[PDB]
Amino acid sequence: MFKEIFTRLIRHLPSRLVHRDPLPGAQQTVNTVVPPSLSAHCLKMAVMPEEELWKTFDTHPEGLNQAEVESAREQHGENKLPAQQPSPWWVHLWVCYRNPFNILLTILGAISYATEDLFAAGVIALMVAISTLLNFIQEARSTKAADALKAMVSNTATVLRVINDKGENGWLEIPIDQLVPGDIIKLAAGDMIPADLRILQARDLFVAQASLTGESLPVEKAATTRQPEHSNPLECDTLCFMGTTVVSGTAQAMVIATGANTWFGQLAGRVSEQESEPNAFQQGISRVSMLLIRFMLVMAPVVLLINGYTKGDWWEAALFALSVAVGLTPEMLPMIVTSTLARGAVKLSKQKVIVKHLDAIQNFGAMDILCTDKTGTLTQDKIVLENHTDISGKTSERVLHSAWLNSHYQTGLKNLLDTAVLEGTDEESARSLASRWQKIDEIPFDFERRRMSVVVAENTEHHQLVCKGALQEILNVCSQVRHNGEIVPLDDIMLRKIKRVTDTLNRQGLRVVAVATKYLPAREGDYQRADESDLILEGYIAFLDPPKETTAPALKALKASGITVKILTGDSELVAAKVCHEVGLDAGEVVIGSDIETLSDDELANLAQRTTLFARLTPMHKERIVTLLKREGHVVGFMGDGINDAPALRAADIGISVDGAVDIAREAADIILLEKSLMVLEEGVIEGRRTFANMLKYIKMTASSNFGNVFSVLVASAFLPFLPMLPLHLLIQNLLYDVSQVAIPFDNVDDEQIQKPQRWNPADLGRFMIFFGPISSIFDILTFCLMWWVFHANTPETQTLFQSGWFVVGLLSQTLIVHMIRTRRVPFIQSCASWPLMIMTVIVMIVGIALPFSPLASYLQLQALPLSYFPWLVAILAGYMTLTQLVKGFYSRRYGWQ
Amino acid sequence: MFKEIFTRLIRHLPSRLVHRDPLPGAQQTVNTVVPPSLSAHCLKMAVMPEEELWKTFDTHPEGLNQAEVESAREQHGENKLPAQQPSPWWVHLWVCYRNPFNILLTILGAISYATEDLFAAGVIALMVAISTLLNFIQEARSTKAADALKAMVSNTATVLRVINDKGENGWLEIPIDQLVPGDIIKLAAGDMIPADLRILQARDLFVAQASLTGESLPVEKAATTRQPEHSNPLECDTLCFMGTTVVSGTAQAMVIATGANTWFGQLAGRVSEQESEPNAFQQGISRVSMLLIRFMLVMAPVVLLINGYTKGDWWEAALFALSVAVGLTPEMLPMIVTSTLARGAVKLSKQKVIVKHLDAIQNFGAMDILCTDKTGTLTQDKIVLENHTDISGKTSERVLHSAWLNSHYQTGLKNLLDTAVLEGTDEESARSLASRWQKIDEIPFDFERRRMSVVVAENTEHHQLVCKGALQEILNVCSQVRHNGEIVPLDDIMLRKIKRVTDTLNRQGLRVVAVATKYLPAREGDYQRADESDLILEGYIAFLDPPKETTAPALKALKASGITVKILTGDSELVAAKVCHEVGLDAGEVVIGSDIETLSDDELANLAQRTTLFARLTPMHKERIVTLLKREGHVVGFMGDGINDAPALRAADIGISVDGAVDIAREAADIILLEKSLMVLEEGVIEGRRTFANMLKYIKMTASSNFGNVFSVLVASAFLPFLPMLPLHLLIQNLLYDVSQVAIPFDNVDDEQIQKPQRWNPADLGRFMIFFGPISSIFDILTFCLMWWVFHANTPETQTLFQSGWFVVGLLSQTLIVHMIRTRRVPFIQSCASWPLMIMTVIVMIVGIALPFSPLASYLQLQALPLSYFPWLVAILAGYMTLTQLVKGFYSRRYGWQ
């Protein structure tokens, strides 16, 4: 067979609904080294004086009004990737109609009924047009809902603009897509860079450029270029590129690039190609579409040739065969995937879960392994008990004052320790310290040395450096200690005693943060990491973060569902073990990052397979563990809300980030939780499994019933001198069945199907179709025999009655078999469908019954049915339902439902 | 007027649905001193030898089988109060039909249509029968649901019985109602006494008889009488009465009394009278019923006299006037109160809230003040951090071992301290201590000395007494301390230093529990409270109970709703203040129980009005505060789950107890929470306010529309030579309107109405009826004019058309005005009714508009309506709706909706 390139009937969904966003910010290291044309304009803008910058981008210090921003947007464009542009509705309607199947339907109908048979081909075009509008309406509604949901959780940028429209200006929050070139914004810690910026002013701005330059260390950014030599576009100290984050400090800069014009837009190579590889969901959809196309190509030509050879009317035979094959078209596949999931997403929106792109739900339904960090999930972020002790254990006010100095002047990410220190310190001493001391510089949290430091001064002759951080990192650089109120050198015995005391504190669940203070003479030169040496240790603050009340029940529910919960923390092993024991999560053996840093990939994969608590991990360690976990059929999902957690989020099959997080974590994630709760995640997982099961059920039903009808009519034409149904009748049946199925996304789901992770095998759909098709065909042949013999529809002159008869049964069959195939169990007693499904089933059955007796039946070439047909119809329906219910067991035993 | 005794048409609901349970266990001190006949049988049973007890009650040590327990139940009766017996369904149907209004309806119809007018009086009886069956069905369904809900949370008793039916026996759990006389059960701490018991065996059984004997101190209970002199039935040491609780110890006893035969059944005086005083809900229902009866007595006789004088047919006039007055009958009042609330209760069942009796919902909707205890609600019961230090502060293993000895052997109620001590202690030392030491006696928690004590021994020569409790109570009795590993006398300076250290610990949120140990020579004599003296203090265990994560948001929501949250704790003031500060609840000034023990009632009432945190309270203090809080229009609800919290629960307007609590707290409470969560309580409060608003709306609509029709027909008969409607048509209209209103309990409620506590004023119903009645009357007179002039229904020979005309619009008015009166806002845009209400409205409108064209119309004396009447009825309906919407503003401004 093969010839996949020849087949082009598949219509793929837009790249926004499925597949991850093509702009993670980092992606991968480029090899083309960008185009040189851009990295001359970048350098020029870096060195271009600020005074003439206003005229270049037509920007004023006050800001931009509505007209100016609109003109800039129209001129330059939108701050979005090209793949993120929604199609116009008329384009969407046209592409939803120009598909080969509907065009061929209309052309063949016109050809068959061109000569002296008007109103026979006009209505057959009307029916396919109604089907096309129905599909377009469903797709448009679902896409609009999904796009609205995605934009609900989007990164915001603070821009001056004009509020009063008279020049009053202010500060707003808008999604990054609306940032036009030549716009003035301000930046703070935790806010990602929305677009390429020219730094206008900066106070201690430190940003993380590891996405682009590959260096984990933060890089300074000054208002004016302090670096000596330019000609390195990425390393210029006055420009910040999109996709980077502000580690610390404050700044105000002007937008200079937007959309593809940004460095990441085209220089990173994202715009060029970068569309060769699809994901698992797209591959499964493509497999299903190819299966349906193969089925149609195998079946429909046989019917066409048989009818044409038997009756001699090749055109009518082709039209009828195409009408039969309509039910198996892949054009339905978008709708389902677009509609069902979207509905589930809406329900997730009511459960404090926002899904960015729909396909993640599949992974979100098969997340057997869940890697999370303890604080925020396992324990409350707010700390209840904190005491500022000294080496001897006595309470020290000096340690608390130094902690306040280091936590009130720092401009980095806000920490639970910083908030607790600010709250605990009394107001009077707070004012005294604020008046006495003033900031001179800042050394941000590099995350390698794990030591945040701040330099302050109260006089122009001496500077005091105060640093906090993990106990071991502080101790590695301290030289002196204030034990007993004297500056005694820190000996090995004192270090061992401190380690014993801190281990005792940790085993109780108290984390330890040390504070060190150093005095230096007045120095104009800016301080760097090298100055953090020979520090005088002051004390260690012991604090407790209580485990959340919901943590234990949520973890129990998660492990009952089958989601193996693993912890990848970057704190002390003892604290993590105590937290896991208190929350009831078994820890087994802890594994430090130093060990895994040397093991082989296979050894680490096996260890992660047989481990639950990983402590003292670098972000590279977390990414490596997440990547190596997905080595044998395991779909691992990571949950992080840090600066460096974006690579880990992208590495995992599904990334989850809390709404109250840094902007990069939200942007790179796939699912956004409105709060950091495990119970919310568990409920969302249940709902997502329900939604995926509903979509699979929809596809299976609509494929199986149509294949059964195709088989029915396939073995019918040899012994019939007329068409068993007219193509118009088949189109009516398909439209009414689709109207009935509209409510399937709202169907209930059996608890058996959502008790385990779902592994979707597209190949199972073919076996399901083959098993559940001929059951309808047997009773369709029975209906043919009933019409031919009992009711004497033996001649073409009385053909129409024949057709009408089968029509009714067919429709009702397609409308009733649903209620006996949406289970592994016995319907209506052991399980029931949702009310909307019942309502639609009743409505469609009533319409199908009334259609032969409707006045339009003569227009639709339908003849009224005699009353003797009704008991036979009921008997056939009951027999079909009973037969399928009894035969479901064989399919359950042979292969299984899930 | 007066003559309230003469009026007896009001039907009261059964005493189980409304009003508290008449068996709190304690009630009040009796003055009749019981009947002497019972307190001779009680003494005889106390002194009657155990060997012959088996034959007296026909009980075997192995237990009782199904036949024997059934025979005993049939002979003696059921373990329930007489007021708790549900009525038989046939009795319920008969009492729901023998009401005077329906009987007079049938009698007057028969009298009017006795002579040559059959099939006219038979059908008028059929309609009232159908209405009676509808009312009975609704009442029966709602009562069954409420009774099922009440029995869900009921006290259980562990009884041997027979499981295998072959004599294997075992231990079961059955609601106390099934405990027949001569049944063998076992008792544990926290289980209330289900019925009068004869103690067969007892290990250190201590029970609280303060309900009966009024003594707070626990009383011993031995298998054989150890007291010297009998003839005091309450103080006999071998019998336990119903309504008492087991403070500590274990026992196995035999049931000797059941139902009213128990001491509390009739000797307490509960059976005799004790039904004079109703509650607020019953008084409001009675006021509404009296209002409706007075309105009927004012209106209907006038119509009867006018029609009888004008037309001369007194019997038909009386029939018609009674049919008009049907809509204002109080017979609907049970249904509503029985149905609506029940529906809400069902929803509360899905929100982990179980309502025992329906009336509490009203109080549960007006609970402006909520008194609760901190632990369990404010903070999690489980404690995260605990360290067993000594006086010098060093960690002491001896203190932990003594705590394990005192917490593993005690049989009292489990404490979080006991659980934490048991878990913290290592298994090896646990086994060593268990093997080394053994119990000799026990001194339970009297709650006055606040010191639980246990005496153990490792040799037959020395006994060690170990006691824990609050720090101050332990220190008040200690004499020596093990400071620095020596037995040094406890001086004042050491006491002051310990107090300073413990206050420092408390200010951080850590509670302090001290442990004292004493040595005694081997003494056979049983130990008492007097032996707790000259104890050697060992150490104080410091533990932390973290505040719940949901506490702060739930408290914020509660205070936003208007529920003032007050705390009545019995712990240290500093700990309560720290907890309140951490959870965000403002504390202001703490108040100790010693101060309030001396203040006057008015002073204490004012203080409680202007205070939030009460610490160091006795249960009497809590009861006094709760009682004095309800001194000015305040509905105060208490939440407790302790032994002594039952009087406080009964004192409050509404009592709330958690499902996981002692049996007495659950039994005496009014609402049972499936978990100790404030968010659940807040959601339940919102739902209960919704339910009460729905019931009030139902009553207001069904009264106002009927009064409007009554007024309409009242000023209509003078200028009409025929009845404006037939009584049969009126009955049909009322039945269809009731069918429409069936779904009102499912109506949505505006958030404005449930944003504040509800104060139900029955007198407002009359003003609402007077304001919203004549609007319907104006358009009814318009309909009369339309029929008389435009359609020329000027003679009795063409009377029926007239009637039929009005019929239609009449019904539609009563069916449509609903949608424009269930608001203070504009309908269908600013607020909408629930879908079931819309469905019922549409169905009833269709039925009413189709009845004149139905074949039964001739049977119902109804004539088909000309098509010209349809635009007129549509215009009349639109005008009536618009007029009501416009004039709603005047009613809202003059009085107000809520």
Ligand SMILES: Nc1ncnc2c1ncn2[C@@H]1O[C@H](COP(=O)(O)OP(=O)(O)OP(O)(O)=S)[C@@H](O)[C@H]1O
């Ligand atoms: N700018 C900073 N970036 C990262 N960590 C910081 C920073 N400043 C201080 N820290 C500390 O370093 C720890 C590293 O934790 P992360 O794993 O990066 O994030 P997290 O949410 O705190 O999860 P944990 O700490 O591993 S339980 C933080 O918990 C802080 O105590």
Ligand SMILES: Nc1ncnc2c1ncn2[C@@H]1O[C@H](COP(=O)(O)OP(=O)(O)OP(O)(O)=S)[C@@H](O)[C@H]1O
């Ligand atoms: N048998 C007992 N009955 C009552 N309290 C006891 C008993 N044994 C020990 N206690 C202690 O006495 C305290 C009195 O608290 P209660 O108010 O009666 O109940 P509670 O649920 O603990 O609410 P608290 O303690 O006031 S926050 C308990 O918290 C225990 O620490």
Ligand SMILES: [Mg+2]
């Ligand atoms: Mg931001």
Ligand SMILES: [Mg+2]
């Ligand atoms: Mg600097």
Ligand SMILES: [Mg+2]
């Ligand atoms: Mg069919």
Ligand SMILES: [Mg+2]
């Ligand atoms: Mg019990």
Ligand SMILES: [Mg+2]
């Ligand atoms: Mg004893």
Ligand SMILES: [Mg+2]
């Ligand atoms: Mg009316």
